[PDB]
Amino acid sequence: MELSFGARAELPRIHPVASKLLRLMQKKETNLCLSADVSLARELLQLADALGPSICMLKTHVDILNDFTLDVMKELITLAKCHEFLIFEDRAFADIGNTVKKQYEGGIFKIASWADLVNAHVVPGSGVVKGLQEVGLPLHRGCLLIAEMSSTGSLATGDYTRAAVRMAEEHSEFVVGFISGSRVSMKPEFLHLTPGVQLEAGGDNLGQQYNSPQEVIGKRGSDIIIVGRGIISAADRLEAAEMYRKAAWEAYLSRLG
Amino acid sequence: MELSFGARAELPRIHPVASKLLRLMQKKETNLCLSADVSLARELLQLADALGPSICMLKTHVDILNDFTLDVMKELITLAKCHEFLIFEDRAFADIGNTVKKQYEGGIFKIASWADLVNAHVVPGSGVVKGLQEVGLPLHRGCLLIAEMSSTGSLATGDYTRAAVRMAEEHSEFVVGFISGSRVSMKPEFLHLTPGVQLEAGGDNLGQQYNSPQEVIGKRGSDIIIVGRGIISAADRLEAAEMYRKAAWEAYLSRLG
Numbered sequence A, B: 001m002e003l004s005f006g007a008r009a010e011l012p013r014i015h016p017v018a019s020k021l022l023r024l025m026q027k028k029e030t031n032l033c034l035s036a037d038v039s040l041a042r043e044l045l046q047l048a049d050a051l052g053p054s055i056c057m058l059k060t061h062v063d064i065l066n067d068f069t070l071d072v073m074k075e076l077i078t079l080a081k082c083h084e085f086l087i088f089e090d091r092a093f094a095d096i097g098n099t100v101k102k103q104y105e106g107g108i109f110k111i112a113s114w115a116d117l118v119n120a121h122v123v124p125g126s127g128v129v130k131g132l133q134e135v136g137l138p139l140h141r142g143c144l145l146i147a148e149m150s151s152t153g154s155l156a157t158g159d160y161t162r163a164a165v166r167m168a169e170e171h172s173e174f175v176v177g178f179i180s181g182s183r184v185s186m187k188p189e190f191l192h193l194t195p196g197v198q199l200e201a202g203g204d205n206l207g208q209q210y211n212s213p214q215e216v217i218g219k220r221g222s223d224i225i226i227v228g229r230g231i232i233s234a235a236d237r238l239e240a241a242e243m244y245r246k247a248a249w250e251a252y253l254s255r256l257g
């Protein structure tokens, strides 16, 4: 009884951020999230403008931007609104609730002011979600819980993954899905976003492992592929993004029937 | 066959950063780490200057400082050198190796340029340590692995904790100890630093749980207490720091015999 992204956008328990995302995925025929892993604001913004039509989401690591300013994020928001994609800051919050609330709202980055989505590790227990929610609920934001990781020797397996799923399902007012390698929740209101994706087999020299869009979306049942170097290191990043988009989209359609 | 901090500083396999720390702990009769959880640079620096003589370490969350600049960290280093304490940035790195290396070296914060110590979660597998090491070894830095957490519902238990200890013991050129609630390694070259510490029983409203210095150092065998609000929210932060210092030090001495 698998539903399209557009039908999932209308589910009774859908979060507004998830709904917005699912609708634009359906409209634009994309379930690709660009991992914009660059150190220069100009490159970030040039990528966001050129690839915006091809992506449902742009994932940032703001803490690697050498020339971060809040005005850069204002410019990114303009592009996100123009091309219709969400902004996801991959901060992987992983401390006690009292601390992560400050890390989310404050400091130099003011992440909550510009990020539609953030993510959190579940290792601290559910206080990490409660802390983030105190800032994110008033700001109408969503959160993803890291249920599995793509890297060699990941401990996010077995009962750890099951604990992530329970924590999500128990904080559905704020948690809209997962970072995972596969479908981990049976509830269709939750999004599954999967990093560690390339067309070719391989990995990197620091524990990253790759699987293909057909494997991740088609066989493992995830929703969205997150792709960094597969696109960013390519000469023509637009064509690379289109190849990943078409791969992930067709894998999704075939799983739908 | 328990050894003093000063003797542990001389162990054959001791890391240089651990040795420096252990020597100043012995010299100053302090095993207190101040968790300087403030949002203003002026308050951070006033705390570091006044409390510097009472502490072996000052722990930062640079990402909650509203007015962070690299010049603030230069001023903090001057104080750390004057009063003899290490600087520990509690960044809790928790991503793939390729990403954390950039988060450690680069961006606005340039953490590796000023932090003696950082910490990492073990959930991504050992690539998190390998990535950090590529930056930290050339810069003569050390790392702490998060083996246990103080918060309600922590998943850093059982085999997860055992995996943290193995990962530390296998990367002893860079990893100098743990964030933990107790002694988790039997090897005396490793430091144990414990947050979730207050004199009085209690917790916070976002999953923090407190135990006393006597419990953590004396009964659970940890080395250093990490104390934030117990000191920071007190009217007289200097006297508060002295109370925590004397508590942790005497608990240590009594465990020594």
Ligand SMILES: O=c1cc(O)n([C@@H]2O[C@H](COP(=O)(O)O)[C@@H](O)[C@H]2O)c(=O)[nH]1
Pocket (backbone or CB within 6 Å): A035, A037, A061, A090, A148, A149, A150, A151, A179, A195, A196, A197, A208, A226, A227, A228, A229, A230, B095, B096, B099
């Ligand atoms: O399990 C995970 C969780 C992540 O955040 N990531 C992130 O997703 C991206 C993967 O990038 P790449 O496609 O270049 O390997 C990185 O930004 C990394 O930080 C991951 O690779 N695996």
Ligand SMILES: O=c1cc(O)n([C@@H]2O[C@H](COP(=O)(O)O)[C@@H](O)[C@H]2O)c(=O)[nH]1
Pocket (backbone or CB within 6 Å): A095, A096, A099, B035, B037, B061, B090, B148, B149, B150, B151, B179, B195, B196, B197, B208, B226, B227, B228, B229, B230
């Ligand atoms: O398990 C852990 C790991 C932490 O980093 N911390 C950190 O240690 C400090 C505890 O501060 P406090 O004493 O105010 O509760 C915080 O900065 C928090 O981020 C913790 O409390 N428990």
